[PDB]
Amino acid sequence: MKAKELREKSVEELNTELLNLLREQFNLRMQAASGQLQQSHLLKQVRRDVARVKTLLNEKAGA
Amino acid sequence: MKRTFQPSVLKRNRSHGFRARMATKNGRQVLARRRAKGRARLTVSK
Amino acid sequence: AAKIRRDDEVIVLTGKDKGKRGKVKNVLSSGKVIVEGINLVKKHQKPVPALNQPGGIVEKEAAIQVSNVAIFNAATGKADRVGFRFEDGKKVRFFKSNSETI
Amino acid sequence: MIREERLLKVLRAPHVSEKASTAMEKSNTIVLKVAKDATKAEIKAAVQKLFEVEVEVVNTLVVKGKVKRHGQRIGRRSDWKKAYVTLKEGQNL
Amino acid sequence: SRVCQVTGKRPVTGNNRSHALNATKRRFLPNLHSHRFWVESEKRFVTLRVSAKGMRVIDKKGIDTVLAELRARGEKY
RNA sequence: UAAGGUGAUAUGAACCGUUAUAACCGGCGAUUUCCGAAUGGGGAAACCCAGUGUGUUUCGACACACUAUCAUUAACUGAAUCCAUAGGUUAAUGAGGCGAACCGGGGGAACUGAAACAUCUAAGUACCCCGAGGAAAAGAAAUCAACCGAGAUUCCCCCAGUAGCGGCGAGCGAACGGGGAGCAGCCCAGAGCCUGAAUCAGUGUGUGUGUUAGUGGAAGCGUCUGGAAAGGCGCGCGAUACAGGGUGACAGCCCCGUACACAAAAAUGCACAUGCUGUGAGCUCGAUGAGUAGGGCGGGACACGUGGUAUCCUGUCUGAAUAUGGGGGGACCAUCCUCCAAGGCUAAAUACUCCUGACUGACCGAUAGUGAACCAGUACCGUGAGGGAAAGGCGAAAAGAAC
RNA sequence: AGGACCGAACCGACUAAUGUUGAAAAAUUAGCGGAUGACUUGUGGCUGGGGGUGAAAGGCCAAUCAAACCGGGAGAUAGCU
RNA sequence: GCUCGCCGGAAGACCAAGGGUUCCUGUCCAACGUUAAUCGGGGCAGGGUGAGUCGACCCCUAAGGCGAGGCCGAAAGGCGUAGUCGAUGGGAAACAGGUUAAUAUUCCUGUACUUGGUGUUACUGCGAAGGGGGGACGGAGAAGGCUAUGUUGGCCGGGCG
RNA sequence: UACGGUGCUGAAGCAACAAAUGCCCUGCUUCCAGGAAAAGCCUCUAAGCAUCAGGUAACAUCAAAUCGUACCCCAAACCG
């Protein structure tokens, strides 16, 4: 990450969003599986979107 | 009636199957010949 | 490069209609394109209106070689040649028959 | 720590079939998909605080075989794990 | 292996021949045999397999030559 | 690169992108499941389970790594045993396994030819074990040569089917020396003087010359025939360009191209500067190659069958000299001549291929070409090593026969 | 009690018939030979080719044996058809 | 459906393995079935398989294999210690009422029950891989007890010609 | 209630004797050719450690993970 986006909108939600990080994805995964209104673009919202920040934040090593 | 073979699946894996051949010089040489012939099966033990 | 695109008129130089013109309605892969109204052929199948359609079935124009379309000249009623690049303007189609180039 | 919030990696999808639409109609029971480890050590302590409902009991079975699709070569269905979850009201000791 | 542990000297291919026409392979073998030696710099004895005339070399060279044939092949005493 | 895109059979449907992270391509990266040499330990491959340590309680061990074996470089512990050391613990690095052919060491045929057949040949080949390199091997004269001279090695052509050897038979067949390809030399047997000095590597960078996602590139129409033309006819046009891919009849001019024109974020072949650091000069006096040579007994390798058998190698006995000393010069002696063994390393002409890339195809066209053009080492068969198919081509356009 | 006699399970073949392009490269019938024993049987392991195993037949070693099965040498060799 | 007939230690019936959807539903007849075929142990698309307790895993081990260090063998390979695996042997807890087209010692409904962990109060030596005890295992022979079972009686439901 | 299933209700529910291959039983008895071991379990101690862990008593308490489960069955679902 270049300094214009480096550690913005990411470290300040690293622990405080953790109680909704998997629940909000699960909520949408359960809904994107139903076929409601034939919406298939939801599979590009519950995936290809929600790992994109935290996996660029990875630099601590170990646990 | 019958003709010299068992349904025994253990005897079909224990001595000519992958781990049993992979434990032997000449068996590891068969794994190479199956790759040289280009078969989709490395072992027919199953 | 792409010589034809969606906006210029094509003469269709094949022995398919031997007159009629159109434009590209969709651009495809592997050297093919679709041209508006050129091949609206009926298919020998039932329309199944189900009292849910008024109704009928509808023709859709089918893929042809991009090498068969050719641009229309609109000056003598013949085909034209495109060409590429100029000393001014980015990635421009040259139009080998016009003294003006963008 | 004891239990992390990383452990909320449970559940895959809903499922829809007449067995549930008939033989689970007079119970508050639901059908779900789970992945290979079936989360058997953490699912009960997780799903009670993940889906707005309280859980009574959890089970999971494996849907196996059906290797046939075409008259030439093989097209495998491959194994998948199907969960049956019942939601709670009151107590029963 | 009947190969000399202090020199690397090996068996050799060769035939047996007579007045007669039919001849056969023989292959000749090294004469190595056990002897116990003293390792004074380690205050201990060691048992080593040596050939005839081979000790007459070691007894004029010192055992630190043999302990360097051994170490060249990582072998312990 | 591109207004396109969410791959094919694929229809359908929901969405994306065009200045603001489009899809796709090339380069530079990120993360990297389980089993496998498989290696913490196990097992009926994709399963089951330890120890140790660091962080942490939110106080059920949660989180996350390391850990076969030997060798090497070296600690911790340590029995008989006093110090020590076997044994045990650990870390760091190396080896293992797989791979086409050539290659080095070990093991190594038969059939075939000799018109039989036992020596010989086939043949150190086929095949099996092990190891290793870009080649292996060979190497800087214990070389020859012949009293005249050459001056590391190897491969090709000759020498020469001669001289040799040979159940003297079949066969085997040189050397010396000549013509080429190809020509780098160094280190130990210690260590003082002198120094980091061609050369290589590791890590970092730059330039030149190639390779590359790429980019431009001429002209044929009118009309007749026909369902459809490039044919025919009429009048031509481009020619550095009429190679041929083809495309919907005989296309230089339809497109894709050809001749020719263009360019380098960065990666990368090659050659070279250079920063750091490791490696390597210059010079001199000593040391100075021993169970090693030589001689027998048994043999091998030599074209050579052991003969008069030298050379080179040696299982085994014997056994020195040590430089007026040692080796070979075809048994051996004498003289003469020329090298100096008993430590090691190495440039490339050569051998070779699964692969990668180009170049040529008077090679094939479905009982041709590989087992193979039809999702064919796939179906099919066998306990398994192993064996292994049958089966092409409606059209321009599915317009694949509505009503 | 029983290396006794009867006899079903099980094991095994004296005769007659059926079958060998047969249902089957060993199965069938009717009278049967044995049947606590040198018995027989479920299961696994160990032993391999000029070697195994055999109250030991060139028998058995997966239809195969005076050297089986598979591959390589191999396009063996054939004064002959 | 009714009747007739055959088998009845089997031509009845319970269950592992091993095979592989054969169990459920639909439509496909083209191919299949040693005949029609409307049927399916056929073709094809979809449905159905839930465990603290079952049988397995963990623990322990036979025959035997695997085997660091150690050893023999040109080599392939073999031997073997420390250890480590392993069944055809030994070890913790399960039975069966509900039922759907097809599911169940698994869910539903009851009852039974074993092993491992966390922790307080009071008092307080616990404990092995070692030692002991037991586990524990020849083949027949001969009484007794007992129970699902047998066969009538009674009882309830029905029959009375 | 679409009775398209899904419940509600409910009789008798007992005596006689005989009886296994199953249960007492791997019992007992009897002869002989003299007949697996280990672990769980009980218990003794070694180790190590301390108002820890364990043990005895009372009482709360977290888990039971790992594999399989349909269908066939002396059978046109195994083997030929």
Coordinates of N, CA, C and O (backbone and C1' of nucleotides) in Angstrom, one line a residue, chain F residues 189-263:
Chain F
rA189 P 52.6 -26.8 1.6 O5' 53.3 -28.2 1.5 C5' 53.0 -29.2 2.4 C4' 53.9 -30.4 2.1 C3' 55.4 -30.2 2.0 O3' 56.2 -30.2 3.2 C1' 54.7 -31.5 0.2
rG190 P 56.7 -28.9 3.9 O5' 55.4 -28.6 4.9 C5' 54.8 -27.4 5.0 C4' 55.6 -26.4 6.0 C3' 54.8 -25.3 6.6 O3' 55.5 -24.9 7.7 C1' 56.2 -24.5 4.9
rA191 P 54.9 -23.8 8.8 O5' 55.4 -22.5 8.2 C5' 56.7 -22.0 8.4 C4' 56.9 -20.7 7.6 C3' 55.8 -19.7 7.8 O3' 56.4 -18.4 8.0 C1' 56.5 -20.0 5.5
rG192 P 55.7 -17.3 8.8 O5' 56.6 -16.1 8.6 C5' 57.9 -15.9 9.3 C4' 59.0 -15.4 8.3 C3' 58.6 -14.1 7.6 O3' 58.7 -13.0 8.4 C1' 59.6 -15.7 6.1
rC193 P 57.8 -11.7 8.0 O5' 58.4 -11.2 6.6 C5' 59.7 -10.6 6.5 C4' 60.1 -10.3 5.1 C3' 59.0 -9.4 4.3 O3' 59.1 -8.1 4.6 C1' 59.8 -11.3 3.0
rC194 P 57.9 -7.2 4.5 O5' 57.2 -7.5 3.1 C5' 57.8 -7.0 1.9 C4' 56.9 -7.3 0.7 C3' 55.6 -6.6 0.9 O3' 55.6 -5.3 0.4 C1' 55.4 -8.8 0.0
rU195 P 54.5 -4.2 0.8 O5' 53.2 -4.6 0.0 C5' 52.0 -4.9 0.7 C4' 51.1 -5.6 -0.3 C3' 49.6 -5.7 0.1 O3' 48.9 -4.6 -0.3 C1' 50.5 -7.8 -0.6
rG196 P 47.4 -4.4 0.2 O5' 46.4 -5.3 -0.7 C5' 46.2 -5.1 -2.1 C4' 45.3 -6.2 -2.7 C3' 43.8 -6.0 -2.3 O3' 43.0 -6.3 -3.5 C1' 44.6 -8.2 -2.0
rA197 P 42.8 -5.2 -4.6 O5' 44.0 -5.5 -5.6 C5' 44.1 -6.7 -6.3 C4' 45.2 -6.7 -7.4 C3' 45.3 -8.0 -8.2 O3' 44.7 -7.9 -9.5 C1' 47.3 -7.6 -7.0
rA198 P 43.2 -7.5 -9.8 O5' 43.2 -7.9 -11.3 C5' 42.7 -9.1 -11.8 C4' 43.0 -9.4 -13.2 C3' 42.3 -10.5 -14.0 O3' 41.4 -10.0 -14.9 C1' 44.6 -11.0 -13.7
rU199 P 40.5 -10.9 -15.9 O5' 39.9 -12.0 -15.1 C5' 40.4 -13.4 -15.3 C4' 40.1 -14.2 -14.1 C3' 38.7 -14.2 -13.6 O3' 37.8 -14.8 -14.5 C1' 40.2 -14.4 -11.8
rC200 P 36.3 -14.4 -14.5 O5' 35.7 -15.1 -13.2 C5' 35.5 -16.5 -13.2 C4' 35.3 -16.9 -11.8 C3' 33.9 -16.5 -11.2 O3' 32.8 -17.3 -11.6 C1' 35.6 -16.2 -9.6
rA201 P 31.3 -16.7 -11.7 O5' 30.9 -16.4 -10.2 C5' 30.7 -17.5 -9.3 C4' 30.7 -17.1 -7.9 C3' 29.5 -16.3 -7.4 O3' 28.3 -17.1 -7.4 C1' 31.5 -15.5 -6.4
rG202 P 26.9 -16.5 -7.4 O5' 26.7 -15.7 -6.0 C5' 26.6 -16.3 -4.8 C4' 26.7 -15.3 -3.7 C3' 25.7 -14.2 -3.8 O3' 24.4 -14.5 -3.4 C1' 27.8 -13.4 -3.1
rU203 P 23.1 -13.8 -4.2 O5' 23.2 -12.3 -3.8 C5' 22.9 -11.8 -2.5 C4' 23.3 -10.4 -2.2 C3' 22.8 -9.4 -3.2 O3' 21.4 -9.0 -3.1 C1' 25.1 -9.0 -2.8
rG204 P 20.6 -8.5 -4.3 O5' 21.3 -7.1 -4.7 C5' 21.1 -6.0 -3.8 C4' 21.9 -4.8 -4.3 C3' 21.6 -4.4 -5.8 O3' 20.3 -3.9 -6.0 C1' 23.9 -4.0 -5.1
rU205 P 19.8 -3.8 -7.5 O5' 20.7 -2.7 -8.3 C5' 20.6 -1.4 -8.1 C4' 21.7 -0.6 -8.7 C3' 21.7 -0.6 -10.2 O3' 20.7 0.3 -10.7 C1' 23.9 -0.9 -9.5
rG206 P 20.1 0.3 -12.2 O5' 21.3 0.8 -13.1 C5' 21.6 2.1 -13.1 C4' 22.9 2.3 -14.0 C3' 22.7 2.0 -15.5 O3' 22.2 3.2 -16.2 C1' 24.7 1.0 -14.6
rU207 P 21.5 3.1 -17.6 O5' 22.6 2.6 -18.7 C5' 23.6 3.4 -19.2 C4' 24.6 2.7 -20.0 C3' 24.1 2.1 -21.3 O3' 23.9 3.0 -22.3 C1' 25.7 0.7 -20.2
rG208 P 23.0 2.7 -23.6 O5' 23.7 1.5 -24.4 C5' 24.9 1.7 -25.1 C4' 25.6 0.4 -25.6 C3' 24.8 -0.4 -26.5 O3' 24.8 0.0 -27.8 C1' 25.9 -1.7 -24.8
rU209 P 23.8 -0.5 -28.9 O5' 23.8 -2.0 -29.0 C5' 24.7 -2.8 -29.8 C4' 24.5 -4.2 -29.6 C3' 23.1 -4.8 -30.0 O3' 22.9 -4.8 -31.4 C1' 23.9 -5.7 -28.0
rG210 P 21.4 -5.2 -32.0 O5' 21.2 -6.6 -31.5 C5' 19.9 -7.1 -31.3 C4' 20.0 -8.5 -30.8 C3' 18.7 -9.1 -30.4 O3' 18.0 -9.7 -31.5 C1' 20.1 -9.4 -28.6
rU211 P 16.4 -9.7 -31.6 O5' 15.9 -10.5 -30.3 C5' 15.9 -11.9 -30.3 C4' 15.2 -12.4 -29.0 C3' 13.8 -11.9 -28.9 O3' 12.8 -12.5 -29.7 C1' 15.0 -11.8 -26.8
rU212 P 11.5 -11.8 -30.2 O5' 10.7 -11.2 -29.0 C5' 9.9 -12.1 -28.2 C4' 9.3 -11.4 -27.0 C3' 8.3 -10.2 -27.3 O3' 7.0 -10.6 -27.7 C1' 9.8 -9.8 -25.4
rA213 P 5.9 -9.6 -28.1 O5' 5.1 -9.3 -26.8 C5' 4.2 -10.3 -26.3 C4' 3.3 -9.7 -25.2 C3' 2.2 -8.8 -25.9 O3' 1.2 -9.5 -26.5 C1' 3.1 -7.9 -23.8
rG214 P 0.2 -8.8 -27.6 O5' 1.2 -8.4 -28.7 C5' 1.0 -7.2 -29.5 C4' 1.4 -6.0 -28.7 C3' 1.2 -4.8 -29.7 O3' -0.1 -4.2 -29.6 C1' 3.4 -4.8 -28.9
rU215 P -0.9 -3.8 -30.9 O5' 0.0 -2.8 -31.6 C5' 0.1 -1.5 -31.0 C4' 0.8 -0.6 -32.0 C3' 0.2 -0.5 -33.4 O3' -0.9 0.2 -33.4 C1' 2.6 -0.6 -33.5
rG216 P -1.9 0.3 -34.7 O5' -1.0 1.2 -35.7 C5' -1.0 0.9 -37.1 C4' 0.0 1.7 -37.9 C3' -0.1 1.5 -39.4 O3' -1.0 2.2 -40.1 C1' 2.1 1.3 -38.6
rG217 P -2.0 1.4 -41.1 O5' -0.9 0.8 -42.2 C5' -0.2 1.7 -43.0 C4' 0.8 0.8 -43.9 C3' 0.1 -0.1 -44.8 O3' -0.4 0.5 -46.0 C1' 1.9 -1.2 -43.7
rA218 P -1.8 0.1 -46.6 O5' -1.5 0.3 -48.2 C5' -1.3 1.5 -48.8 C4' -1.2 1.3 -50.3 C3' -2.4 0.7 -50.9 O3' -3.3 1.8 -51.1 C1' -0.4 -0.3 -51.7
rA219 P -4.9 1.5 -51.3 O5' -5.0 0.9 -52.7 C5' -4.9 1.7 -53.9 C4' -4.8 0.8 -55.1 C3' -6.0 0.0 -55.4 O3' -6.9 0.8 -56.2 C1' -4.1 -1.4 -55.4
rG220 P -8.4 0.9 -55.9 O5' -9.0 -0.5 -55.9 C5' -9.1 -1.2 -57.2 C4' -10.4 -2.0 -57.2 C3' -10.3 -3.1 -56.2 O3' -11.6 -3.5 -55.6 C1' -10.7 -3.9 -58.4
rC221 P -12.4 -2.4 -54.7 O5' -13.3 -1.6 -55.8 C5' -14.4 -2.2 -56.4 C4' -14.7 -1.5 -57.8 C3' -16.0 -1.8 -58.4 O3' -17.1 -1.2 -57.8 C1' -14.2 -1.8 -60.0
rG222 P -18.6 -1.8 -58.0 O5' -18.9 -1.7 -59.6 C5' -19.3 -0.5 -60.2 C4' -19.4 -0.6 -61.7 C3' -20.4 -1.7 -62.1 O3' -21.8 -1.3 -62.1 C1' -18.4 -1.8 -63.4
rU223 P -22.9 -2.3 -61.8 O5' -22.8 -3.3 -63.1 C5' -23.2 -3.0 -64.4 C4' -22.8 -4.1 -65.4 C3' -23.5 -5.4 -65.1 O3' -24.8 -5.5 -65.7 C1' -21.1 -5.7 -65.6
rC224 P -25.7 -6.7 -65.3 O5' -25.2 -7.9 -66.1 C5' -25.4 -8.1 -67.5 C4' -24.6 -9.3 -68.0 C3' -25.1 -10.6 -67.5 O3' -26.2 -11.1 -68.1 C1' -22.7 -10.5 -67.5
rU225 P -27.1 -12.3 -67.5 O5' -26.1 -13.5 -67.1 C5' -25.7 -14.5 -68.1 C4' -24.9 -15.6 -67.4 C3' -25.7 -16.1 -66.2 O3' -26.7 -17.0 -66.6 C1' -23.3 -16.0 -65.8
rG226 P -27.9 -17.2 -65.6 O5' -27.3 -17.7 -64.2 C5' -27.1 -19.0 -64.0 C4' -26.6 -19.2 -62.6 C3' -27.5 -18.6 -61.5 O3' -28.6 -19.3 -61.1 C1' -25.2 -18.0 -61.2
rG227 P -29.8 -18.7 -60.4 O5' -29.4 -18.4 -58.9 C5' -30.3 -17.8 -58.0 C4' -29.8 -17.8 -56.6 C3' -28.4 -17.2 -56.4 O3' -28.5 -15.8 -56.3 C1' -28.6 -19.3 -55.3
rA228 P -27.4 -14.9 -56.9 O5' -26.1 -15.3 -56.1 C5' -26.0 -15.0 -54.7 C4' -24.7 -15.7 -54.1 C3' -23.4 -15.3 -54.8 O3' -22.9 -14.1 -54.2 C1' -23.5 -17.6 -54.5
rA229 P -22.2 -13.0 -55.1 O5' -20.9 -13.7 -55.6 C5' -20.0 -13.0 -56.5 C4' -18.7 -13.8 -56.5 C3' -17.7 -13.2 -57.5 O3' -17.0 -12.1 -56.9 C1' -17.8 -15.5 -57.8
rA230 P -16.2 -11.0 -57.7 O5' -14.9 -11.7 -58.2 C5' -13.9 -11.0 -58.9 C4' -12.6 -11.8 -59.1 C3' -12.8 -13.1 -59.9 O3' -11.6 -13.4 -60.6 C1' -12.1 -13.5 -57.7
rG231 P -11.4 -13.0 -62.1 O5' -12.1 -14.2 -62.9 C5' -11.5 -15.5 -62.7 C4' -12.1 -16.5 -63.6 C3' -12.5 -16.0 -65.0 O3' -11.5 -16.5 -65.9 C1' -14.4 -16.8 -63.9
rG232 P -10.9 -15.5 -67.0 O5' -12.2 -15.1 -67.9 C5' -12.8 -16.1 -68.8 C4' -14.1 -15.5 -69.4 C3' -13.9 -14.2 -70.0 O3' -13.4 -14.3 -71.3 C1' -15.9 -14.2 -68.6
rC233 P -12.5 -13.2 -72.0 O5' -13.4 -11.9 -72.0 C5' -14.5 -11.7 -72.9 C4' -15.3 -10.5 -72.7 C3' -14.6 -9.2 -72.6 O3' -14.1 -8.8 -73.8 C1' -16.2 -9.3 -70.9
rG234 P -13.0 -7.7 -73.9 O5' -13.5 -6.4 -73.2 C5' -14.5 -5.6 -73.8 C4' -14.9 -4.5 -72.8 C3' -13.7 -3.7 -72.4 O3' -13.3 -2.8 -73.4 C1' -15.1 -4.1 -70.5
rC235 P -11.8 -2.4 -73.5 O5' -11.5 -1.5 -72.2 C5' -11.9 -0.2 -72.2 C4' -11.7 0.4 -70.8 C3' -10.2 0.4 -70.3 O3' -9.4 1.4 -70.8 C1' -11.7 -0.3 -68.5
rG236 P -7.8 1.5 -70.4 O5' -7.5 0.3 -69.5 C5' -6.5 0.3 -68.4 C4' -7.3 0.4 -67.0 C3' -6.3 0.6 -65.9 O3' -5.9 2.0 -65.8 C1' -8.0 -0.9 -65.3
rC237 P -4.4 2.3 -65.4 O5' -4.3 1.9 -63.8 C5' -5.0 2.6 -62.8 C4' -5.0 1.9 -61.5 C3' -3.6 1.6 -60.9 O3' -3.0 2.8 -60.3 C1' -5.0 -0.2 -60.7
rG238 P -1.4 2.8 -60.2 O5' -1.1 1.8 -59.1 C5' -1.4 2.1 -57.7 C4' -0.7 1.1 -56.8 C3' 0.7 0.8 -57.1 O3' 1.6 1.8 -56.7 C1' -0.4 -1.2 -56.6
rA239 P 3.0 1.9 -57.5 O5' 3.8 0.5 -57.5 C5' 4.2 -0.1 -56.3 C4' 4.7 -1.5 -56.6 C3' 6.0 -1.7 -57.2 O3' 7.1 -1.7 -56.3 C1' 4.3 -3.3 -57.9
rU240 P 8.1 -0.6 -56.1 O5' 9.1 -1.2 -55.1 C5' 10.2 -2.0 -55.5 C4' 10.7 -3.0 -54.4 C3' 9.6 -4.0 -54.0 O3' 10.3 -5.2 -53.7 C1' 10.3 -2.6 -52.2
rA241 P 9.8 -6.5 -54.4 O5' 8.4 -6.7 -53.8 C5' 8.2 -7.5 -52.6 C4' 6.7 -7.3 -52.1 C3' 5.7 -7.8 -53.1 O3' 4.8 -8.7 -52.4 C1' 5.1 -5.8 -52.1
rC242 P 5.2 -10.2 -52.1 O5' 4.3 -11.0 -53.2 C5' 4.7 -11.0 -54.5 C4' 3.7 -11.8 -55.4 C3' 4.4 -12.4 -56.6 O3' 4.9 -13.7 -56.5 C1' 2.1 -11.6 -57.0
rA243 P 6.1 -14.1 -55.6 O5' 5.6 -14.0 -54.1 C5' 4.7 -14.8 -53.5 C4' 5.4 -15.8 -52.6 C3' 4.4 -16.8 -52.0 O3' 4.4 -17.9 -52.8 C1' 5.4 -15.6 -50.2
rG244 P 3.0 -18.7 -53.1 O5' 2.4 -19.0 -51.7 C5' 2.9 -19.8 -50.7 C4' 2.1 -19.7 -49.4 C3' 0.7 -20.2 -49.5 O3' 0.3 -20.8 -48.3 C1' 0.8 -18.0 -48.7
rG245 P -1.1 -21.4 -48.1 O5' -1.7 -20.5 -46.9 C5' -1.2 -20.5 -45.6 C4' -2.1 -19.8 -44.6 C3' -3.6 -20.1 -44.8 O3' -4.1 -21.3 -44.3 C1' -3.2 -17.8 -44.5
rG246 P -4.2 -22.6 -45.1 O5' -5.1 -22.2 -46.4 C5' -6.5 -22.0 -46.3 C4' -6.9 -20.6 -45.7 C3' -8.4 -20.3 -45.9 O3' -9.1 -20.9 -44.8 C1' -7.1 -18.4 -46.4
rU247 P -10.7 -21.2 -45.0 O5' -11.4 -19.9 -45.3 C5' -11.8 -18.9 -44.3 C4' -12.4 -17.7 -44.9 C3' -13.6 -18.0 -45.7 O3' -14.8 -18.1 -44.9 C1' -12.2 -16.5 -46.9
rG248 P -15.7 -19.3 -45.1 O5' -16.4 -19.2 -46.5 C5' -16.7 -20.3 -47.3 C4' -17.3 -19.9 -48.7 C3' -16.4 -18.9 -49.4 O3' -16.2 -19.3 -50.8 C1' -18.6 -18.1 -49.0
rA249 P -17.3 -19.5 -51.9 O5' -16.7 -20.3 -53.1 C5' -15.8 -19.8 -54.1 C4' -15.3 -20.9 -55.0 C3' -14.2 -20.6 -56.0 O3' -13.5 -21.7 -56.3 C1' -16.2 -21.1 -57.2
rC250 P -12.0 -22.0 -55.9 O5' -11.1 -21.5 -57.2 C5' -10.9 -20.2 -57.5 C4' -9.9 -20.1 -58.6 C3' -9.6 -18.6 -58.9 O3' -8.2 -18.6 -59.1 C1' -10.3 -19.7 -60.8
rA251 P -7.4 -17.3 -58.9 O5' -7.4 -16.9 -57.4 C5' -8.3 -16.0 -56.8 C4' -7.7 -14.6 -56.8 C3' -6.4 -14.5 -55.9 O3' -5.6 -13.5 -56.3 C1' -8.3 -13.4 -54.9
rG252 P -4.3 -13.7 -57.1 O5' -3.4 -12.5 -56.7 C5' -2.7 -12.5 -55.5 C4' -2.2 -11.2 -55.1 C3' -3.3 -10.2 -54.8 O3' -3.7 -10.2 -53.4 C1' -1.7 -9.3 -56.3
rC253 P -5.2 -10.1 -53.0 O5' -5.6 -8.6 -53.4 C5' -5.3 -7.5 -52.7 C4' -5.7 -6.2 -53.3 C3' -7.2 -6.2 -53.8 O3' -8.1 -6.0 -52.7 C1' -5.8 -5.2 -55.4
rC254 P -9.6 -5.5 -52.9 O5' -10.2 -6.0 -51.5 C5' -11.6 -5.9 -51.3 C4' -12.0 -6.8 -50.1 C3' -11.1 -6.7 -48.9 O3' -11.3 -5.6 -48.1 C1' -11.7 -8.9 -49.5
rC255 P -10.1 -4.8 -47.4 O5' -9.6 -5.8 -46.2 C5' -10.3 -5.9 -45.0 C4' -10.1 -7.2 -44.3 C3' -8.8 -7.5 -43.7 O3' -8.6 -6.9 -42.4 C1' -9.5 -9.4 -44.9
rC256 P -7.2 -6.7 -41.8 O5' -6.5 -8.1 -41.7 C5' -6.9 -9.0 -40.7 C4' -6.2 -10.3 -40.9 C3' -4.7 -10.2 -40.9 O3' -4.1 -9.9 -39.6 C1' -5.2 -11.6 -42.6
rG257 P -2.8 -9.0 -39.5 O5' -1.9 -9.7 -40.5 C5' -0.9 -9.2 -41.3 C4' -0.4 -10.2 -42.3 C3' 1.0 -10.0 -42.9 O3' 2.0 -10.5 -42.1 C1' -0.6 -10.6 -44.6
rU258 P 3.5 -9.9 -42.3 O5' 3.8 -10.0 -43.9 C5' 4.3 -11.2 -44.5 C4' 4.7 -10.9 -46.0 C3' 5.8 -10.0 -46.2 O3' 7.0 -10.6 -45.9 C1' 4.1 -9.6 -47.8
rA259 P 8.2 -9.7 -45.2 O5' 8.5 -8.6 -46.3 C5' 9.2 -9.0 -47.5 C4' 9.3 -7.9 -48.5 C3' 10.0 -6.7 -47.9 O3' 11.4 -6.8 -47.9 C1' 8.1 -6.0 -49.0
rC260 P 12.2 -6.5 -46.5 O5' 11.8 -5.0 -46.1 C5' 12.3 -3.9 -46.8 C4' 11.5 -2.7 -46.5 C3' 11.5 -2.1 -45.1 O3' 12.7 -1.3 -44.8 C1' 9.3 -2.1 -45.9
rA261 P 13.0 -1.0 -43.2 O5' 11.8 0.0 -42.7 C5' 11.6 1.3 -43.2 C4' 10.4 1.9 -42.4 C3' 10.7 1.9 -40.9 O3' 11.5 2.9 -40.5 C1' 8.5 1.2 -41.4
rC262 P 12.4 2.7 -39.2 O5' 11.4 2.6 -38.0 C5' 10.6 3.7 -37.7 C4' 9.6 3.4 -36.5 C3' 10.4 3.0 -35.3 O3' 10.9 4.2 -34.7 C1' 8.4 1.8 -35.6
rA263 P 12.2 4.1 -33.7 O5' 11.6 3.5 -32.4 C5' 10.9 4.3 -31.5 C4' 10.3 3.5 -30.4 C3' 11.4 2.8 -29.5 O3' 11.8 3.7 -28.5 C1' 9.6 1.3 -30.2

